[PDB]
Design an enzyme around this catalytic site. Structure first.
Site, PDB file in Angstrom:
ATOM      1  N   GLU B  39      24.422 -12.959   9.530  1.00 49.24           N
ATOM      2  CA  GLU B  39      25.737 -12.556   9.045  1.00 49.24           C
ATOM      3  C   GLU B  39      25.724 -12.583   7.520  1.00 49.24           C
ATOM      4  O   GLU B  39      25.684 -13.658   6.911  1.00 49.24           O
ATOM      5  CB  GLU B  39      26.824 -13.474   9.601  1.00 49.24           C
ATOM      6  N   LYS B 128      35.993 -15.614  16.497  1.00 48.79           N
ATOM      7  CA  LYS B 128      35.382 -16.612  15.631  1.00 48.79           C
ATOM      8  C   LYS B 128      36.354 -17.765  15.420  1.00 48.79           C
ATOM      9  O   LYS B 128      37.526 -17.549  15.096  1.00 48.79           O
ATOM     10  CB  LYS B 128      34.986 -16.005  14.286  1.00 48.79           C
TER      11      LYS B 128
END
Lengths: 134, 203
Positions: B39, B128
């Site tokens: 990420e 998330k």
């Protein structure tokens, strides 16, 4: 005859006649250069004969044949740690754990190499991994 | 889907750096360490160029995506760069519409049950959990009842001492950022193989 000379070296390794066993493994290597068992056994015999520089070359030739042997990578870590390449041995112990994260010995020996190499934080994280396995 | 890839590798490298060359080094070390979900946060200056300069890792089997996306116009540069998933620390509904139309996976930031419901009504089932260091694994185990479909990928408070607590609670993956970023481009690779081992060892 390629297998028979490997069995000969195993028998000679049982009688502590290691140098005579190394000649048996080498003859099977000349008969079949792709016998990974002959290379791996030759490395463990030269390791005890303390031909550590030649021992690591046979271990690398064994890993070159079968690249997914956690026993071969962990044994290459022992030779390279005793030889002096502590950073190359830690990279070898790393490849051993990439193949088997349950190897309590490879995780314990990696923490010892890192503790002598500098990073205590990288060594401590490796020590806790080995302790949790056993 | 991307979910099956999240369920396999089980770890996402929340990479945060200062320069463009610093980011490409840590991404090479993380991928060499076994972590395939990387990420790349957009707090890094010119993060849209780091993602397109790491395009060769997509041939080696790496999943490079853009994280910490605050505005939708930032997601424009993220999708056009070649990112394969968009990650935001908050729930932005307009970003979800853009990612759905363009066909990009989007993982919003959620901390409360109400923020989860609003994200579920947008069609999201993978959220998330930011910051995980405040909600804790008890939060994940609490939402397993009323919302049996949501799958969490926490980011905060995920260390080696409690990485099994998150997984045994019911998370889909974990996003480790501080532990993987800190260190030299050779310590980062070692930190990955140690973190991958503990995840594989969890019950």
């Amino acid at each position: 005859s390629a297998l028979a000379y490997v069995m000969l070296g195993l028998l000679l390794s049982l009688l502590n006649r290691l140098s005579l066993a190394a000649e048996a493994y080498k003859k099977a290597i000349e008969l079949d250069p792709n016998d990974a068992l002959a290379w791996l056994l030759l490395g463990s015999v030269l390791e005890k004969l303390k031909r550590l520089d030649e021992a690591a070359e046979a271990y690398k030739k064994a890993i070159e044949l079968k690249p997914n042997d956690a026993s071969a990578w962990k044994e290459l870590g022992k030779v390279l740690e005793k030889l002096g390449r502590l950073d190359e041995a830690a990279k070898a112990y790393a490849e051993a754990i990439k193949l088997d994260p349950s190897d309590a010995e490879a995780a314990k020996e990696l923490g010892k190499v890192l503790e002598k190499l500098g990073q205590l934080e990288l060594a401590e994280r490796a020590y806790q991994l080995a302790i949790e396995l056993d | 889907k991307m979910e099956e890839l999240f369920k396999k590798h089980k770890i996402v490298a929340v990479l945060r750096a200062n320069s463009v060359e610093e980011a490409k080094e840590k991404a090479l070390a993380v991928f060499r360490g076994g972590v395939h979900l990387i990420e790349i946060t957009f707090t890094v200056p010119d993060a849209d160029t780091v993602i397109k300069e790491l395009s060769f890792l997509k041939e080696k089997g790496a999943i490079i995506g853009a994280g910490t996306v605050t505005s939708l116009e930032q997601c424009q540069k993220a999708v056009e760069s070649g990112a394969e998933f968009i990650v935001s620390p908050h729930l932005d509904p307009e970003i979800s519409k853009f990612c759905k139309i363009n066909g990009v996976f989007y993982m919003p930031g959620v901390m409360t049950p109400t923020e989860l419901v609003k994200a579920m009504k947008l069609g999201h089932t993978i959220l998330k959990l930011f910051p995980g260091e405040v909600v804790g694994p008890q939060f994940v185990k609490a939402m397993k009842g009323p919302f049996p479909n949501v799958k969490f990928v926490p980011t905060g408070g995920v260390n080696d001492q409690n990485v099994c607590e998150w997984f045994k609670a019911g998370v889909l993956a974990v996003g480790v950022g501080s532990a993987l970023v800190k260190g030299t481009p050779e310590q980062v690779e070692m930190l990955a193989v140690l973190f991958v081992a503990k995840i594989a060892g969890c019950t």
